[PDB]
Amino acid sequence: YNFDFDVMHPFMVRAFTPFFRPGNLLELGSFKGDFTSRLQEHFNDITCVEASEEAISHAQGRLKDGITYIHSRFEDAQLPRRYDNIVLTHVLEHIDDPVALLKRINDDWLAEGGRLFLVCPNANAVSRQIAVKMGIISHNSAVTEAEFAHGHRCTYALDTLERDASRAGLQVTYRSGIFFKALANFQWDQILQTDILSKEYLDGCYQLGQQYPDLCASIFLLCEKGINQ
Amino acid sequence: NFDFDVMHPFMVRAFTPFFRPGNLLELGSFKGDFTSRLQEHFNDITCVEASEEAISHAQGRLKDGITYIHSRFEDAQLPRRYDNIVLTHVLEHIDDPVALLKRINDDWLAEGGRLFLVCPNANAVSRQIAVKMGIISHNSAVTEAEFAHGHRCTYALDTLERDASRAGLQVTYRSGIFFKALANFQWDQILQTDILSKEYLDGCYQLGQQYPDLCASIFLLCEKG
Amino acid sequence: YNFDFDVMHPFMVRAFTPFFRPGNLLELGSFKGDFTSRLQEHFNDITCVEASEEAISHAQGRLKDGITYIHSRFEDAQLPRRYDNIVLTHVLEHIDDPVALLKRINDDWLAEGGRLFLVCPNANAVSRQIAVKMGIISHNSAVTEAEFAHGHRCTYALDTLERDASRAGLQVTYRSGIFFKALANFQWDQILQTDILSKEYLDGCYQLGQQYPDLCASIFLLCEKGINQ
Amino acid sequence: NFDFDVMHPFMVRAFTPFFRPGNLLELGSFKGDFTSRLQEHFNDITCVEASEEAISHAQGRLKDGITYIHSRFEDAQLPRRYDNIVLTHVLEHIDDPVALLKRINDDWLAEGGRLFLVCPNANAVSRQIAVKMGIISHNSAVTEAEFAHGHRCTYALDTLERDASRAGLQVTYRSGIFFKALANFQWDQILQTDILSKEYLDGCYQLGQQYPDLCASIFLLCEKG
Numbered sequence: 001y002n003f004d005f006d007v008m009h010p011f012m013v014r015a016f017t018p019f020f021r022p023g024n025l026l027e028l029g030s031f032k033g034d035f036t037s038r039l040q041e042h043f044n045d046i047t048c049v050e051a052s053e054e055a056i057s058h059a060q061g062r063l064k065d066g067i068t069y070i071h072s073r074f075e076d077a078q079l080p081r082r083y084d085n086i087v088l089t090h091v092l093e094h095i096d097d098p099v100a101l102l103k104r105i106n107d108d109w110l111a112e113g114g115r116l117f118l119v120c121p122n123a124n125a126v127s128r129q130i131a132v133k134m135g136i137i138s139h140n141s142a143v144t145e146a147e148f149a150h151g152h153r154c155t156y157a158l159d160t161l162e163r164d165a166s167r168a169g170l171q172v173t174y175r176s177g178i179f180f181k182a183l184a185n186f187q188w189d190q191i192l193q194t195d196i197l198s199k200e201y202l203d204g205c206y207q208l209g210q211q212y213p214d215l216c217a218s219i220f221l222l223c224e225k226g227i228n229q
Numbered sequence: 230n231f232d233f234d235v236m237h238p239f240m241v242r243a244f245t246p247f248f249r250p251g252n253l254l255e256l257g258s259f260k261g262d263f264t265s266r267l268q269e270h271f272n273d274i275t276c277v278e279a280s281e282e283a284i285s286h287a288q289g290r291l292k293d294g295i296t297y298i299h300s301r302f303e304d305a306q307l308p309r310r311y312d313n314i315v316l317t318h319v320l321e322h323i324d325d326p327v328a329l330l331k332r333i334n335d336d337w338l339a340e341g342g343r344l345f346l347v348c349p350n351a352n353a354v355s356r357q358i359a360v361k362m363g364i365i366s367h368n369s370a371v372t373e374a375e376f377a378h379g380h381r382c383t384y385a386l387d388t389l390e391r392d393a394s395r396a397g398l399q400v401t402y403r404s405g406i407f408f409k410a411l412a413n414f415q416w417d418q419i420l421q422t423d424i425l426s427k428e429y430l431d432g433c434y435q436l437g438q439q440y441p442d443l444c445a446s447i448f449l450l451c452e453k454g
Numbered sequence: 455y456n457f458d459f460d461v462m463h464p465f466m467v468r469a470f471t472p473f474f475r476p477g478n479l480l481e482l483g484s485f486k487g488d489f490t491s492r493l494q495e496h497f498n499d500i501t502c503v504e505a506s507e508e509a510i511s512h513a514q515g516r517l518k519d520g521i522t523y524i525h526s527r528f529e530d531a532q533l534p535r536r537y538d539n540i541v542l543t544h545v546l547e548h549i550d551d552p553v554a555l556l557k558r559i560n561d562d563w564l565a566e567g568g569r570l571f572l573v574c575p576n577a578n579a580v581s582r583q584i585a586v587k588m589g590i591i592s593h594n595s596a597v598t599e600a601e602f603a604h605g606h607r608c609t610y611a612l613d614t615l616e617r618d619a620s621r622a623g624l625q626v627t628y629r630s631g632i633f634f635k636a637l638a639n640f641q642w643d644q645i646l647q648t649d650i651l652s653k654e655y656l657d658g659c660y661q662l663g664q665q666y667p668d669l670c671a672s673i674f675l676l677c678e679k680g681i682n683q
Numbered sequence: 684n685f686d687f688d689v690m691h692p693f694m695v696r697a698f699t700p701f702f703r704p705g706n707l708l709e710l711g712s713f714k715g716d717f718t719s720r721l722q723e724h725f726n727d728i729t730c731v732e733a734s735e736e737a738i739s740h741a742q743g744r745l746k747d748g749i750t751y752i753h754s755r756f757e758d759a760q761l762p763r764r765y766d767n768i769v770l771t772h773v774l775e776h777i778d779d780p781v782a783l784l785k786r787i788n789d790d791w792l793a794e795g796g797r798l799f800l801v802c803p804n805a806n807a808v809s810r811q812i813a814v815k816m817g818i819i820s821h822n823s824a825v826t827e828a829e830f831a832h833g834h835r836c837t838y839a840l841d842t843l844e845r846d847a848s849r850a851g852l853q854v855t856y857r858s859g860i861f862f863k864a865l866a867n868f869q870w871d872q873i874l875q876t877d878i879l880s881k882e883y884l885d886g887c888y889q890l891g892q893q894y895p896d897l898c899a900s901i902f903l904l905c906e907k908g
């Protein structure tokens with residue numbers, strides 16, 4: 001059990017489902033294709049952009065047909081088309097110039113009526129706030145040493161995430177949160193090996209999280225295209 | 230009027246990303262004040278309203294493309310099932326709310342259809358301040374004036390989802406509409422002044438989504454169970 | 455490990471400590487003396503009112519000197535004195551007429567300058583809200599069957615608790631919450647047998663709970679005497 | 684003025700149940716506006732203020748029982764240690780806030796003494812609405828105007844407790860003062876009207892305690908580590 005892959009990925013797909021547009025999907029930062037496989041249950045026409053040849057090859061081997069793979073960094077990517085749905089989940093925090101990426105999404109890649117599904121780890125998640133109170137993390141939006149090593153350049157909260165989307169020219173249509181998270185991953189991974197927490201308890205955390213977006217594991221902005229000339 | 234001038238447009242904004250293609254049923258359409266806004270999104274709207282006077286008034290002021298059904302909910306015979314059903318600021322008046330919601334689930338929602346269920350929120354900031362002030366006993370109380378207006382309940386997210394769930398609906402999304410720190414009587418006064426802008430109101434709508442429990446109205450997006 | 459006795463009792467004493475007045479203390483509903491023993495670290499002159507002869511006898515055996523024991527129901531209790539500190543923790547929810555008890559506290563028992571420490575289980579605790587979303591409990595302020603069996607007649611939240619204090623003539627001076635609680639007791643009691651959660655993590659829950667009173671395990675009103683004639 | 688007329692009295696209300704018997708030190712007492720309120724609770728108050736003009740003004744308008752110390756914090760030589768230390772709306776101006784807090788911990792607090800640390804809150808409702816409106820980039824930003832006024836930080840509970848902790852203080856209680864949904868410029872306008880009562884303001888103070896993160900100002904009660 002990995003909390004991110006086994007718990008968060010499915011709830012993210014749940015969170016997105018009511019907002020999906022008919023048509024195609026673009027997955028930015030598809031890596032090894034773990035999230036793509038869930039998206040394939042919803043879309044037959046998926047385009048995947050990933051900078052790592054190794055990751056993109058693994059995906060290619062594992063996933064079913066109907067994926068267009070684009071091996072590129074986002075700033076160099078030349079896409080053949082515009083997209084009805086764009087997924088950017090746990091990628092923006094790794095980008096040196098996040099406004100410039102969101103701006104490409106707005107200006108170059110969103111179809112008319114298209115939607116961006118923008119999801120990042122939340123600074124203000126309960127578990128993270130507890131770690132801040134414990135002094136393990138200096139403050140909520142801090143980037144820790146491990147985090148920086150893993151490539152994080154920011155730790156978004158709803159305030160700074162909407163700022164950057166807004167700065168990029170996107171229209172933010174909906175703000176929400178995914179999964180009320182009171183334990184840290186290291187704790188989840190241990191507890192999930194036990195029968196202490198049920199699947200219903202997890203579903204409850206998802207359900208309650210919608211009522212306290214600011215306290216969830218990940219925060220979620222639904223965005224639409226704004227006119228920029 | 231805060232409710233018609235501020236709340237109605239934000240309710241439509243909140244629904245817009247969830248609307249399904251197809252038709253729409255408005256339950257409790259009254260004089261058509263909300264229907265007019267919905268007409269910007271749908272050419273095929275069916276309206277159910279028990280007051281003949283109200284429904285007559287709407288018919289007078291709305292554009293073509295409306296099927297009007299003059300009936301109590303318990304008596305209503307609808308000719309189709311619906312991709313979108315709106316029940317906004319109605320359920321808190323209903324003596325047996327779960328029974329109405331169960332008709333929606335079992336009879337009126339199309340497969341794939343969505344119910345837009347919106348009710349005034351007991352935990353709204355302005356109401357909580359009124360409770361702290363001793364004006365209202367507690368958040369989910371029904372005041373004498375509200376009871377006189379026909380309220381039988383003051384929903385919060387907990388009680389509203391309970392009733393939807395008991396009816397057999399699948400509650401898909403929970404949210405709030407408008408971060409509300411002032412009472413209607415105060416808004417109606419301040420709205421005559423230039424102390425608050427439209428951008429302020431927009432800001433309250435945006436912030437509201439981040440604190441659903443504190444909003445003016447709470448919103449459950451539901452699907453057929 | 456019992457979450458209530460091992461985790462909540464000590465945090466309750468922490469929560470109270472900054473507000474304690476010099477002088478004596480009255481503990482209403484002292485039962486077997488589990489909480490009294492912690493209070494004895496702070497006060498040498500404690501008066502304990504308890505309706506159960508069995509419980510009050512157990513306390514008597516176990517606790518150190520400096521306790522005045524009063525075996526009475528609250529409505530019949532004739533106390534010799536007024537008190538600088540009154541503790542009513544997890545008792546008010548068991549009372550058929552809670553305003554009438556709080557009114558005795560205001561009118562008969564609080565000394566001038568005296569403080570009431572009023573603590574009840576919170577309807578809106580995170581764990582409880584999750585159980586509501588799971589459909590195990592109908593709504594936050596519901597009283598479940600097990601709860602009713604244990605003697606609960608109400609499940610307070612900050613709104614209804616301040617209402618009743620106010621109705622009784624008390625002045626509510628401070629509102630807070632004790633312990634950010636995302637798991638149910640049955641889960642705590644299992645997890646506490648493991649090394650999954652540390653003492654620092656628990657302290658973090660206490661610390662964060664103060665910032666979200668409405669979501670804590672127990673809610674806490676600090677009250678002072680109001681004039682009633 | 685919202686800050687002097689509403690905020691100051693609620694700050695005293697918030698401190699009152701935590702006050703220790705003994706003496707009190709007010710750091711950054713300026714013209715004595717807050718000191719006058721504290722004088723209702725303490726006969727032995729020591730005031731530290733760097734502006735000679737300000738401190739002269741206070742001396743003119745305050746009652747006996749005040750020791751005035753005209754000094755920068757870094758230079759201040761205090762004759763005693765203090766049972767109560769007040770540092771309200773000062774720390775956000777200090778270039779090295781942890782260094783000031785460390786002097787408080789190590790040199791000025793009496794054993795058993797309490798520090799009343801209060802700063803304007805980045806996550807205040809009114810500020811969050813301003814951020815959603817695009818007026819301020821984000822909650823903890825410092826605006827040009829605020830920077831011109833000397834702010835170097837916009838604290839929230841997370842950053843304020845971080846700095847107190849780094850100084851070696853023991854953070855004993857965390858709270859908020861005043862649930863604030865309107866900006867000062869809006870309060871100052873609405874306060875001229877009769878749209879909001881004193882009971883409304885009291886209600887905002889009461890509700891604020893239940894949502895510290897959303898208050899006008901945040902309040903840490905600290906003790907010596």
Ligand SMILES: [Cl-]
Binds near residue numbers: 310339
């Ligand atoms: Cl159907």
Ligand SMILES: [Cl-]
Binds near residue numbers: 764792793794
């Ligand atoms: Cl000392």
Ligand code: NA
Binds near residue numbers: 228229
């Ligand atoms: Na442009």
Ligand code: NA
Binds near residue numbers: 682683
């Ligand atoms: Na009386």
